[PDB]
Design an enzyme around this catalytic site. Structure first.
Site, mmCIF file in Angstrom:
data_model
loop_
_atom_site.group_PDB
_atom_site.id
_atom_site.type_symbol
_atom_site.label_atom_id
_atom_site.label_comp_id
_atom_site.label_asym_id
_atom_site.label_seq_id
_atom_site.Cartn_x
_atom_site.Cartn_y
_atom_site.Cartn_z
ATOM 1 N N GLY A 1 0.883 -1.140 0.000
ATOM 2 C CA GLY A 1 0.000 0.000 0.000
ATOM 3 C C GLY A 1 0.916 1.182 0.000
ATOM 4 N N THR A 2 0.367 2.363 0.222
ATOM 5 C CA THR A 2 1.185 3.553 0.250
ATOM 6 C C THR A 2 2.028 3.472 1.505
ATOM 7 O OG1 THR A 2 1.156 5.950 0.073
ATOM 8 C CG2 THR A 2 -0.299 4.952 1.718
ATOM 9 N N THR A 3 2.737 4.560 1.792
ATOM 10 C CA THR A 3 3.608 4.653 2.961
ATOM 11 C C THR A 3 3.000 5.531 4.058
ATOM 12 O OG1 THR A 3 5.748 4.207 1.845
ATOM 13 C CG2 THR A 3 5.765 5.642 3.810
#
Lengths: 234, 230, 243, 243, 124, 245, 230, 230, 230
Positions: free
Chosen positions: C29-31
């Site tokens: 996923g994103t950070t």
């Protein structure tokens, strides 16, 4: 050889961390007709391309009201949409009787996400096969959203979903600077939506029988223009 | 890994989809008409041998007209097999990372690759040392070789062969059947070219259809799209 | 293997792969990052602008719980909101019973116990997200980071998502050259920095930064969203150092 | 062809491997623990490995305080053990309430070895992959030590061990107890006993410990306590010379 | 292996429930135990095996008191016996002592226990 | 080959085959035909009996929902009886609450919100019934708002409105023919001979007033199911025009 | 087991990933151009024989130009087969403990190993004693051997056999077809090198792609990570 | 059954794990260097034959240098095959009671046993009577036998016939190709030893790794532990 | 892709369903009666040879009436094999996009294709190099070739063969059985044509039925119909 033992249930993670049953669902949204939505700072608009069976059957609608200030268009499995749009009508009514305040659009997203949610985490069922573009006008003016069966609701400025929807989204992505500023005038915000939708036709062209439109904004309660009344845009 | 990315890139740029599509167009027009041509070329050549009477005279020379067909055929097989390897090279280098998921496209790749190999097997022909399926394949692209070897063995029993003083005989025959067999070896190898080419038409037409339909999946076996995760 | 199909099943070595795959979906996923300054903490997430048609300042990824807890996650976004609504009830009923706003450490178990549970029954799918959160209570500030197996701990600052290592090494560092609590203000600043540096895995996809924080001195005990001026500064105060 | 997938099916030799596999998971902990009893105290030992400069160790233990007299140590994943720790932590509360007196070590262990049996026969869930070690100073047996496992087993230990190193820490004790010919450690105060374990463990592992590589708790005349961070360094010093 | 021995609900072609026999195997494995009826008494005994002498075996009974006139022992899966016991000492009150003001005869307790034993079977 | 065994399983291309097969169950029914005219709506069906000992009227392929709504089904009969029953209750109840007649499409609507109740597992609510219904409906009615309407209900859960439509084993050829016949200015008597003609065509057996049932509905007299003598002569009167042209 | 750990360590240090990656780079540039070179070398050599007339003169000597190609080919196969065994040695020694779980990477290992062996089979060629699949593989790397053996048998029938004592002879070959066959044996074995190399290109290009993609899993089949247990 | 227990005991005491571990150590050092030695021994021997011109003189004697290699090779195969049977004897006698459960270790045993047999097949070589997989295996350990048999058949054709007086000969064999074939038979069988040994290195290195990892399970296929039952 | 659509279109217009249906009608009437004709043609030809006495006279000529049958047969097989390839070409080009769903029709296509190939195998016959199933197939369409080759070998043993001064004979033959074998070779190859044709009737009648039933699915393997989505 070459199976995929990870796509049988919505309740199984593939080795990489993907939910294939949910993925297949989106695939059914792609197979449905196209629909477009775009909004400025005074209105929001839904333009949809109704489909049909014979030259004898009727074109199946895809715009749905939810309150005087809210509505959506759909792509995919008709029934699923019914259930969803319906759950929405309910949520708005509660927030209206009890508190006497018009349900904000963002909220309607969370709500449609958390409901779509449940269907990706439990055994026995299947995920909704239908995408929706919601529009409305709360205390933050115009509003447009795009929900997918995975529970992902994103707030855009415009967009389209459905087969060939691609071309229309492209168009909208350029004419942006132009329409985002069409304030005070609805007739032009719609002619814009209609142009953008035509970027996705291949079979025919939009006739008075298969075109549907809807608007909502500043001083325009959600109303739907059907057939013989959308003639001045064809 | 910026260099490892390079190698794989140059590879796919050397053999693009355009390279393989060109092969299909050629088979669509040129290559098919040629096969249909070699078809009747040996068809009438088989009719001639049927209306001829063989004598010792025909055992003292190899019919140049037949060598003209078996040669013209070997030539066509040669080309096809190379044009196929082109299409194969286009796919083989586009087989994705080995996974246990998302192999819907990969399946298509392997599927087409199999039909192509089945084609290459026909053209390459049977040979003389054999694959568990036998030699149900008409005649290889080494017809010339097999033909001369078959006729050669009979031309020795007939003209017979020898020495001098007193009579050239040495051994020849009386077997009236051995003479007719020299006639059949010329007739059969002409029939084998009719059939081999009839089937080869079908095979080629099939691969064309098979390619034109699944080509998208052949180049793009997997379509990345992470809309859920973020 | 037939041990990676069901969620309850133990592999011969006592391994539950379905939960593991859960993690594979999280580290993609994103950070998301979490900084624990002296009194209070700081959170920040990486939002990814896919197209130009995306009203900015909208589509928020950070949610407040009660009115003193920050909360950010990475992975399956819907699973996200979910795990939090529960946290929101769990919170509320607790304050309604004891009066005193819920202890950040207490809160974590509630969530763990819950995520815990989705690894027990084979009729449900484990949570597909790693969560980072914290806030300031009576014992000051705390900062935890729960994960797909329900496992979790306290951190000095941490982060999960596709690009987390860089976020970690450039995180352990801040610890070493500051062994004594960072800085309220400064945290934010250095926060917007730690994201950019980590975005180099999405480089070709222009993004939007979102920061929130919670502090006994700047927020006043309550968790607030970093918008406005200090929001800009922190960006440039990072865009400058990015050179 | 899946015996070992279902927690309810017997193999032709009445095995139930799912229960068996449950165990290997009690090892991927990679922490060792031994507990020995004094004459009016009881002490458990366990290593405290913290492989990350980011995790703040304060929140990194495997020994909790069930009640104001009983303490527990777990040889398994922090998620699962955190569960059990809670149920038992509650059985305590309710027992007291329903019977007028504080619940004994030996009992609580039976409620659990039972609970993790029904847990396992009705198949209402997967068995927890951990081993639980209950210690306390009972008023009808003082130095008390009982240990339950995933298969729903338990018993009394004069002092036991658990981890990837059963036998070592164990035999080492069997030869020390083989001499004293008694079933307990002799000493007037805990302080000294503690020193006895660390002492008698480094011997089996072959490694030195500091004020952070270990972790210990002890039980007195009704008053269970966890050994301090700095304070654990103490007895470590005192017994670094009386060799 | 059959395809009938993995379901309590399933009859093999001959007519033998399966899971039961494998369960009955875990028993034919357990530690040896016996019982002898006298004329003025009855004796029940079973052996003990130590995992290690580091463990106190005098905190885990194997011969249990159900009623002050009945005791019982076993052979097979340890843990079952422990609770099968406490459920037996109860079904002994709630089902007899609390209805008849007295403890139950041998025969009926054994049947009240086999009753609980029955349930485990009939039901997947 | 592998994705067609679960009613709640998407095929890789987003399809629900069990639902599709459901429909394929209808094709096995005998043909049903509906034609709408500004004069009223007509419903006709092929009876198709295995034996001469059956009692014809025993096969209720056309039934009344209410005085202003009727219909013809095709597919599994047991499954039909259940929809017909729900539909009837739906109508009557609405009447009770509003003192008026239920809009044809609003009725059709409730019939579909019923089929929408398939699926077993438990992901939230609860709708007890395993699979899709195996039947379709031709609902002919009339109301003060949109006049004579004709609908097609599918187990999928959706529906369309038609000017004329045919379902069952013969909907293949029947639908083609109707595509080239129907026109807004058809009289009622005209549509009767048309429904009657298309059956005979793509039907099979000699068309007698025993293997063919015909009905209609109008504002004036509601739903009436043509008796045998009428249909009988409507057939003669029909088969006659065939001689000349 | 501190010594058992040593042995396995030294093994993997002798054949690192760098060793096999080097092999891939060589095949990327050098080795591929060489095959494309041997391709046309025998292509024009086949055109020459097609425009020549064979007489008794050509049966009294072996065409040195052809021996130059079949040799240059045998050389290339030799190298490849060795460079492959290098890549295989790099993997084989990295196959983990046999388990019934966590074999996602192991599968990749076995998969690539299979494609490599399929390559080694092509280069090693057919032979003369056969594997159930037959000899659908063009020509082995023992072309030289098979070639001289084929031509040799025909040079005896056309050259003659004359055994002596001065009072009777032996004989001189008349079958006109036997002479043309000597011509074909030179033409075919030149065509067999064209094809064998065309397919060998494809195979090599495939293995390069297959390696460059799955290499991570090839070295690290299992990634330990016990975050749950503690 | 106190005697039946004895027999099985003595069996496993005769072939302990120490016996098989010794075999692995030998392969680790000694046996591997020897194979690498035989590798270049026939590598340079193949280079020599490449730079030589064959005449009638070389058909009147067998090259002792080559017999030195094919012999030195046959010797190595012999040893390996015996050292393998040692490792196999160590396992085979430790295969537990046939059950339908708890075969996690047993699987490992059978697995390794299979890789070992695959090794024994390579060393034992092809032969001359054949297994469904053919003879894709380089050269057996009966190279010496096959070699002399191949060369022998050609030394008769070249030599033919040969009765003497110095003024006339016998035969034959004027076939210029038959002479070059005698040159190739010496070159090929030297190449076959290069390859056979290159692959044999890989195989051995693999078995070493495979053993050093699963050895625990190989000796202790099942680990009794009845903690539940009591 | 407007051009790619074209190619596929022209393909299916060249070989419509009408093309293959015509083939079935021919087999229904013409082709079947012909086979039944060749059936008794060789039936009475076998009866003749049964009532004849063979002498040296019959070894000095090949019975032209037999050659008339084996030829008339080879002709029929030729035609069928070509008419089959027509039906196959009609289907092969109508195999849809490779999917993992909606293959109910595709299955029918593959099924029929298989029965057709089984037919083509019978007509094509056995040959002389062989498919794992052997040669349980009566006689190929190369009966003429095999026949003359069988009789020829025996005509050399009965007759003898000569050269000159000493004695014309040369080769040649008691064995009373060898004479009867020349009689059997004529009788057998006539029986082989009876059987081959009897079975060939059955096969053809089967394919006709198989086609006439599944033809709809053969042309339209998938029937698009998106009534749910919209």
């Amino acid at each position: 050889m070459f199976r995929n033992n990870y796509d049988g249930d919505t309740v199984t993670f593939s080795p990489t961390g993907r939910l294939f049953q949910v993925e297949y669902a989106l695939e059914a949204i792609k197979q449905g007709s196209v629909t477009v939505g775009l909004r400025s700072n005074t209105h929001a608009v839904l333009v949809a391309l109704k489909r049909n069976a014979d030259e004898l059957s009727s074109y199946q609608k895809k715009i749905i009201k939810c309150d005087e200030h809210m509505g959506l268009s759909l792509a995919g499995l008709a029934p699923d949409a019914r259930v969803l749009s319906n759950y929405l009508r309910q949520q708005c009514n509660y927030s209206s009787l009890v508190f006497n305040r018009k349900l904000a659009v963002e909220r309607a997203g969370h709500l449609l996400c958390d409901k779509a949610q449940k269907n990706t985490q439990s055994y026995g069922g299947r995920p909704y096969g239908v995408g929706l573009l919601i529009i409305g006008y709360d205390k933050s003016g115009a509003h447009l959203l795009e929900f997918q069966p995975s529970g992902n609701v994103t707030e855009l400025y415009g967009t389209a979903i459905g087969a060939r929807s691609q071309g229309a989204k492209t168009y909208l992505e350029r004419t942006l600077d132009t329409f985002i500023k069409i304030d005070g005038n609805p007739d032009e915000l719609i002619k814009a939506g209609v142009e953008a939708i035509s970027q996705s036709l291949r079979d025919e062209s939009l006739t008075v029988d298969n075109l549907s439109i809807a608007i909502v904004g500043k001083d325009t309660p959600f109303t739907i223009y059907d057939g013989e009344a959308v003639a001045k845009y064809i | 890994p910026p260099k490892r990315a390079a190698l794989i890139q140059n590879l796919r740029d050397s053999y693009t989809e355009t390279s393989s599509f060109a092969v299909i167009e050629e088979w669509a027009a040129g290559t098919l008409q040629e096969i249909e041509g070699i078809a009747k070329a040996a068809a009438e050549a088989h009719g001639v041998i049927r209306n001829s009477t063989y004598g010792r005279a025909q055992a003292e020379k190899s019919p140049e007209q037949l060598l003209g067909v078996l040669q013209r055929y070997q030539d066509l097989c040669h080309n096809v097999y190379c044009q196929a390897e082109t299409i194969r090279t286009v796919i083989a280098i586009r087989i994705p990372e080995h996974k246990e998921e998302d192999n819907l496209g990969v399946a298509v790749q392997h599927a087409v690759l199999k039909i192509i190999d089945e084609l290459e097997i026909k053209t390459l022909g049977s040979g003389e040392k054999s694959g568990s399926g036998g030699a149900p394949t008409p005649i290889g692209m080494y017809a010339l070789r097999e033909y001369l070897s078959a006729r050669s063995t009979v031309e020795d029993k007939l003209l017979g062969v020898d020495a001098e003083s007193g009579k050239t005989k040495g051994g020849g025959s009386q077997s009236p059947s051995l003479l007719l067999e020299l006639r059949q070896i010329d007739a059969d190898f002409m029939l084998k070219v009719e059939l081999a080419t009839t089937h080869l038409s079908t095979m080629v037409r099939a691969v064309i259809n098979a390619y034109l339909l699944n080509w998208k999946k052949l180049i793009q076996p997997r379509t990345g799209s992470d809309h859920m995760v973020s | 293997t037939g041990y990676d199909l069901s969620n309850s099943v133990f592999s011969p070595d006592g391994r539950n792969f379905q939960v593991e795959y859960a993690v594979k979906a999280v580290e993609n996923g994103t950070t998301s990052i979490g900084i624990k300054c002296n009194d209070g903490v700081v959170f920040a997430v990486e939002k990814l602008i896919t197209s130009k048609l995306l009203v900015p300042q909208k589509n928020v990824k950070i949610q407040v719980v009660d009115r003193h807890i920050g909360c950010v996650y990475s992975g399956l976004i819907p699973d996200g909101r979910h795990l939090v609504n529960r946290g929101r009830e769990e919170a509320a009923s607790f304050k309604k019973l004891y009066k005193t706003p819920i202890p950040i450490p207490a809160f974590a178990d509630r969530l763990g116990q819950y995520v815990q549970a989705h690894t027990l029954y084979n009729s449900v799918r484990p949570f597909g997200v790693s969560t980072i959160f914290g806030g300031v209570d009576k014992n000051g500030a705390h900062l935890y980071m729960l994960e797909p197996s329900g496992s979790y701990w306290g951190y000095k600052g941490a982060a999960t998502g596709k690009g987390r290592q860089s976020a970690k090494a450039e995180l352990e560092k801040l610890v070493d050259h500051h062994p004594e609590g960072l800085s309220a203000r400064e945290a934010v600043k250095q926060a917007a920095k730690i994201i950019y540096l980590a975005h180099e895995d999405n480089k070709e996809k222009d993004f939007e930064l979102e920061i929130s924080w919670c502090s006994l001195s700047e927020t006043n005990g309550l968790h607030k969203f970093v918008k406005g001026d200090l929001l800009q500064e922190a960006i440039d105060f990072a865009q400058k150092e990015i050179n | 062809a899946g015996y070992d997938r279902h927690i309810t099916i017997f193999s032709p030799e009445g095995r139930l491997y799912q229960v068996e596999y449950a165990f290997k998971a009690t090892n991927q902990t990679n922490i060792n623990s031994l507990a020995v009893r004094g004459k009016d105290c009881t002490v458990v030992i366990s290593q405290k490995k913290v492989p990350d400069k980011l995790l703040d160790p304060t929140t990194v233990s495997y020994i909790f305080c069930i009640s104001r007299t009983i303490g527990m140590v777990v040889n398994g994943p922090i998620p699962d053990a955190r569960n059990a720790a809670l149920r038992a932590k509650a059985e305590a509360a309710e027992f007291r309430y329903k019977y007028g007196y504080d619940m004994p070590c030996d009992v609580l262990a039976k409620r659990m070895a039972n609970l993790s049996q029904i847990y396992t026969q009705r198949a209402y869930m997967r068995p927890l992959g951990v081993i639980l070690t209950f210690v306390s100073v009972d008023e009808e047996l003082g130095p008390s030590i009982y240990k339950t496992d995933p298969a729903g087993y338990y018993v009394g230990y004069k002092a036991t061990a658990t981890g990837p190193k059963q036998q070592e820490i164990t035999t080492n004790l069997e030869n020390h107890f083989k001499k004293s010919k008694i079933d307990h450690i002799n000493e007037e105060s805990w302080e000294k006993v503690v020193e006895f374990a660390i002492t008698h463990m480094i011997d089996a592992l072959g490694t030195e410990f500091s004020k952070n590589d270990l972790e210990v708790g002890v039980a007195t005349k009704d008053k269970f306590f966890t050994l301090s961070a700095e304070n654990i360094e103490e007895r470590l010093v005192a017994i670094a010379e009386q060799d | 292996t059959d395809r009938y021995s993995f379901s309590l609900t399933t009859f093999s072609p001959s007519g033998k429930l399966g899971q039961i026999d494998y369960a009955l195997t875990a028993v034919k494995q357990g530690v040896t135990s016996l019982g002898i009826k006298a004329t003025n008494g009855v004796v029940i005994a079973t052996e003990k095996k130590s995992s290690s002498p580091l463990a106190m075996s005098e905190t885990l009974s194997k011969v249990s008191l159900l009623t002050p006139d009945i005791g019982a022992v076993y052979s097979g899966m340890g843990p079952d016996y422990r609770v099968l016991v406490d459920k037996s000492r109860k079904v002994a009150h709630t089902s007899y002592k609390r209805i008849y003001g007295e403890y139950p005869p041998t025969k009926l307790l054994v049947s009240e226990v086999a009753k609980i034993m029955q349930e485990a079977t009939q039901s997947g | 080959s592998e994705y067609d065994r679960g009613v709640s399983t998407f095929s890789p291309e987003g399809r629900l085959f069990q639902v599709e097969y459901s429909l394929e169950a209808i094709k096995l029914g005998s043909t049903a035909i509906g034609i709408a005219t500004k004069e009223g709506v007509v419903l006709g069906v092929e009876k198709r009996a295995t034996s001469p000992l059956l009692e014809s009227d025993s096969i209720e392929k056309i039934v009344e929902i209410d005085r202003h709504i009727g219909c013809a089904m095709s597919g599994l009969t047991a499954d039909a009886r259940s929809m017909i029953e729900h539909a009837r209750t739906a109508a009557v109840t609405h009447n009770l609450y509003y003192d008026e007649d239920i809009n044809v499409e609003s009725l059709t609507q409730s019939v579909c919100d019923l089929a929408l109740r398939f699926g077993e597992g438990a992901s939230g609510e609860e709708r007890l019934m395993s699979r899709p219904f195996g039947v379709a409906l031709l609902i002919a009615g009339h109301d003060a708002d949109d006049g004579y309407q004709l609908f097609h209900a599918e187990p999928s859960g959706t529906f369309y409105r038609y000017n004329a439509k045919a379902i069952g084993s013969g909907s293949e050829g029947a639908q083609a023919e109707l595509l080239n016949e129907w026109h807004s200015s058809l009289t009622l008597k005209e549509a009767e001979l048309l429904v009657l003609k298309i059956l005979k065509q793509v039907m099979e057996e000699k068309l007698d007033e025993n293997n063919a049932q015909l009905s209609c509905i109008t504002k004036q007299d509601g739903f009436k199911i043509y008796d045998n003598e009428k249909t009988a002569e409507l057939i003669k009167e029909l088969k006659e025009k065939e001689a000349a042209e």
